[PDB]
Design a protein around this nucleic acid. Structure first.
Ligand code: ZN
Lengths: 48, 91, 44, 125, 167, 49, 256, 40
RNA sequence: CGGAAGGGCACCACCAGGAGUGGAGCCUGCGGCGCGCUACACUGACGGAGCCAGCGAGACCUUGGCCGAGAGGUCUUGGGAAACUCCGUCGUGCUGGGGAUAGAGCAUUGUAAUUAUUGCUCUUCAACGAGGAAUUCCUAGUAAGCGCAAGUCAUCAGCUUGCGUUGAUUACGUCCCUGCCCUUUGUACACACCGC
């Protein structure tokens, strides 16, 4: 309708610190919630 | 309710109240016909006394207290699969 | 009676079968005791 | 098959599996003799049913026992209970019920916990 | 089959779970074009269309000629013919118009008189005609099928709907 | 965080002192995965842990 | 008996679901009570009929402070019995009290002799209320003031608004003994504010003109952080209400 | 900065004053909930 | 408003015991008060030998091999707790129970170890010699002791919650005291009792 590409333009994401590369792959919300659904599945089948 | 008696009492209700459906319900036998066969062989017992006719409606207490008859081959192979035989009770 | 038949392990027969001077066989009393005798003095 | 029976002695957390058959007179506590129980002073306590009832049917009869769970006291009490239960099971099944009654009433006269288990169930006031 | 057993079963279920036939696209069908409708046209008439043409007093073949800007050929089947014959005496003048050497009779092999089923079979098997009606449910049916020219009656004359060559 | 449990984490190198931790204690926290929590209690044996 | 108790727990979950759908139907039919113009199941069975009996219990290997504190709990509660849980387990414990036939259980938990947790279970497969108690002020701590009157006390509930609060006041009403004297001269309060219920014992008299009280007994703030449908020995039964600590509106939302 | 949950309220003399006056009102009124015995 | 009687109940009463605290040190919650931990040795210390559980399964935990007294580090591989039992040594001496402090040395973690981050080795060997006034709590797998596991929305990490082991003395009566409570219209229905 009425919106700019400078508005919807881009929202990039930063990475893990190069000093904490021993513990790499910083966790984001999407990986967290997928970890959450998998852990909830395991919890539920353990309950069954 | 009173509609529960005016509507919900069924031949199916009294039929699931029947004994071999309760045996198949508590998984005494895998099938209801094998439950009937166990009833005929008298390998079961209903509280104090064992039973032989499938045409039996069981009171709720005896439903809690029904099982196999003692020193039966079926309960013995139960305890044999579970590897928990206790011949002291001629189990 | 029907439910006792269907849920009984032991034998149960029919309950019962469903003018003139008539006699009552079963007595709920020894039949020779006076009513005043069976009455308690407190209750009189 | 061989005339053999299997029973259990069950204490607090101690379960003892007993296998009894007619034999040569050997008693194997986990492959070791009953002369090789652990605490060295409850050896008499585990000896109790054997000398209580005599040694002859134990010469007739070989038993193998394997025990898991429980502390030492629970273990040895479960062991001797398993002994009594296995012997009464064998002497019921393959041997005479009258003699079973005799050893049963004798063991009940001395100590019933060799036969039946002692469940210390709690009570409130 | 006790209700509380069913309750336990659905809770266990939630806790655990947490020769064919395809009719071809017609060769005469660009995406919604239906390029096979060129003069002369071939049209199919309904009883409702006939009676409403009497009511609006329009001429049948002259009306479709002036509406469609070219030459057109009219068709009725035995289903709609028997439907007029069943309507009978009040529409005897409609039968008099329906019997005409200029309208060409088309036969059918059908059991009953459901001219709706007859005509919708025709259009599902041919896709080369132009339907001329006034009926609502059948209108929605020929609307939900694509690439076919509907022409209804209404107002002072006829009105075409889906034909791309409107002028 | 240098030690974690179920719903629990032990976090170092955020403060210089357990006094700093107590000045910021009992507080709403969240992390880059977006997830919430609370700083509750200072660890006594190291300073900012 | 395992089959029996499993059948009773199945019927308990079914009856709670039936009470649930009937309560939603009650919220639906609330609109027609104005257009024209209830206790729980397990507390409806014995609302004013039977006197309750409560076992208070420590968690395990307690401090003397917890000993005297649970003692004070017994002192406040009629028909209450102590239990020093030593080498006892949760399932055999609950099963033994079920064998005895009991109404309610209150078991206590702490940190370094400081009482901070109290759970109440209803024994006929009833609900459990899990509280964190903090601001403990004990009579043992304050003074040798004497002893409690131990008459069946009077109850004062304050600020109970939601149906959660209704379930609460039902549970507390039913844990206190049925049918009090109109002249019961000790009164208990149930003072709710900011989702912090807080309680003190109060003996009271009326003056020549007004009323006069004495606060006595204990004094603290607890907070229900959980309510479960099943018993505590479950640890797996369906939770009836759970506190949300990690939410947006957590320091603002009342009654949660 | 921000906090995560409601603070535990610390109790003051004015708080317990308002409470005990509310109690005085409820007992002067004698209005307070009791588990009365079920009739019949 | 008071007195009197009768009855009941109470590890806040009587009675019999037990176990701590308070005395030394350490930890921790309160402003000098509280909760725990380790000792005060002979039922003990130490060295060998034997070994018996349970709760717990979201570059991590590891079978095995290597050397190093040890701490340790290394290469490979997959995704069996203590108290206890026997023998020996010590022996009544703040002694070898007690390990507080200090030094020295060696290793690991970390930029850096320094104010020993941390562990280990040897030397140094304090207080504590069984805890006043008192205090509490309790009637069976109880107290107690032992060790093991998990932190799983509150609260907890020299800390909470579970778990196992072993396992008692003395009561189990009484209202005598200390209280506290109930009754002093059989109301209700036989027989008996009682009878302001
Ligand atoms: Zn046709």
């Amino acid at each position: 309708k009425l919106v700019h590409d400078v508005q919807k333009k881009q929202h990039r994401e930063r990475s893990q610190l190069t000093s904490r590369s021993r513990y790499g792959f910083l966790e984001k919300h999407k990986d967290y919630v997928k970890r959450a659904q998998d852990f909830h599945r395991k919890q539920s089948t353990l309950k069954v | 309710k009173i509609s529960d008696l005016e509507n919900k009492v069924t031949v199916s209700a009294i039929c699931r109240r029947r004994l071999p459906v309760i045996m198949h319900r508590l998984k005494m036998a895998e099938t209801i016909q094998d439950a009937v066969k166990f009833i005929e062989q008298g390998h079961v017992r209903v509280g104090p006394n064992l039973i032989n006719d499938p045409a039996y409606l069981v009171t709720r207490n005896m439903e809690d207290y029904v099982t196999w008859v003692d020193n039966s081959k079926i309960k013995k192979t139960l305890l044999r699969y579970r590897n928990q035989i206790d011949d002291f009770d001629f189990s | 009676y029907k439910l006792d038949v269907l849920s009984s392990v032991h034998f149960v027969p029919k309950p019962a079968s469903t003018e003139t001077p008539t006699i009552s066989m079963e007595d709920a009393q020894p039949l020779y005791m006076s009513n005043a005798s069976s009455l308690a003095p407190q209750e009189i | 098959a061989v005339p053999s029976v299997q029973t259990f002695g069950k204490k607090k957390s101690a379960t003892a599996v007993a296998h009894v058959k007619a034999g040569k007179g050997l008693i194997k506590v986990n492959g070791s003799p009953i002369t090789l129980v652990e605490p060295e002073i409850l050896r008499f306590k585990v000896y109790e049913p054997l000398l209580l009832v005599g040694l002859d049917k134990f010469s007739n009869i070989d038993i193998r026992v394997r025990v898991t769970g429980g502390g030492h006291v629970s273990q040895v009490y479960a062991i001797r209970q398993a002994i009594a239960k296995g012997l009464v099971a064998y002497h019921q099944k393959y041997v005479d019920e009258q003699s079973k009654n005799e050893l049963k009433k004798a063991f009940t006269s001395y100590d019933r916990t060799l036969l039946i288990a002692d469940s210390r169930r709690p009570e409130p006031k | 089959a006790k209700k509380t057993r069913k309750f336990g079963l659905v809770k266990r279920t939630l806790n655990t779970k947490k020769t064919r036939n395809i009719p071809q696209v017609s060769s005469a069908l660009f995406f919604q074009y239906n390029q096979a409708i060129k003069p002369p046209y071939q049209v199919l008439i309904d009883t409702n269309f006939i009676n409403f043409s009497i009511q609006k007093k329009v001429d049948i073949v002259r009306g479709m000629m002036d509406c469609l800007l070219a030459k057109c050929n009219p068709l009725i089947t035995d289903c709609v013919m028997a439907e007029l014959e069943k309507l009978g005496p009040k529409y005897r003048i409609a039968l008099k118009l329906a019997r005409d050497p200029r309208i060409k009779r088309l036969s059918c092999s059908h059991k009953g008189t459901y001219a709706d089923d007859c005509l919708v079979h025709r259009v599902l098997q041919h896709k080369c005609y132009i339907v001329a009606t006034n009926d609502a449910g059948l209108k929605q049916r020929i609307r939900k099928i694509p690439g076919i020219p509907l022409m209804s009656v209404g107002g002072h004359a006829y009105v075409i709907e889906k034909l791309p060559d409107v002028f | 965080p240098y030690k974690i449990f179920k719903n629990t984490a032990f976090i170092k190198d955020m403060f210089s002192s357990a006094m700093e931790v107590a000045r910021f204690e009992g507080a709403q926290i969240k992390t880059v995965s977006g997830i919430r929590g609370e700083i509750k209690r200072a660890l006594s044996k190291p300073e900012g842990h | 008996m395992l089959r029996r108790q499993a059948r009773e727990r199945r019927e308990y979950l079914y009856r709670k679901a039936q009470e649930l759908q009937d309560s939603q139907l009650q919220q639906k039919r609330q609109i027609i009570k104005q257009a024209l113009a209830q206790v729980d199941d397990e507390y409806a069975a014995t609302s004013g009929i039977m006197d309750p009996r409560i076992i208070v219990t420590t968690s395990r290997d307690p401090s003397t402070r917890l000993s005297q504190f649970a003692k004070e709990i017994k002192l406040l509660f009629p028909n209450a019995v102590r239990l020093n849980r030593g080498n006892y387990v949760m399932p055999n414990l609950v099963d033994a009290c079920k064998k005895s036939g009991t109404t309610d259980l209150v078991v206590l938990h702490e940190h370094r002799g400081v009482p901070t947790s109290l759970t109440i279970s209803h024994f006929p497969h009833g609900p459990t209320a899990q509280f964190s108690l903090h601001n403990v002020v004990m009579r043992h701590d304050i003074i040798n003031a004497g002893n409690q009157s131990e008459v069946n006390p009077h109850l004062i509930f304050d600020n109970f608004t939601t149906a959660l609060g209704k379930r609460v006041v039902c549970i507390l009403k039913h844990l206190f003994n049925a049918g009090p004297k109109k002249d019961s001269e000790r009164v208990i309060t149930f003072a709710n504010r900011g989702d912090f219920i807080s309680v003190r014992q109060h003996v009271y008299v009326r003056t020549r003109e007004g009323v006069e009280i004495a606060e006595v007994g204990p004094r603290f703030e607890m907070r229900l952080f959980e309510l479960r449908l099943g018993t505590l020995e479950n640890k797996d039964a369906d939770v009836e209400w759970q506190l949300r600590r990690f939410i947006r509106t957590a320091n603002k939302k009342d009654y949660l | 900065f921000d906090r995560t949950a409601k603070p535990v309220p610390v109790i003051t003399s004015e708080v317990t004053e308002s409470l005990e006056d509310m109690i005085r009102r409820r007992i002067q009124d004698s209005n307070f909930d009791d588990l009365q015995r079920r009739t019949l």
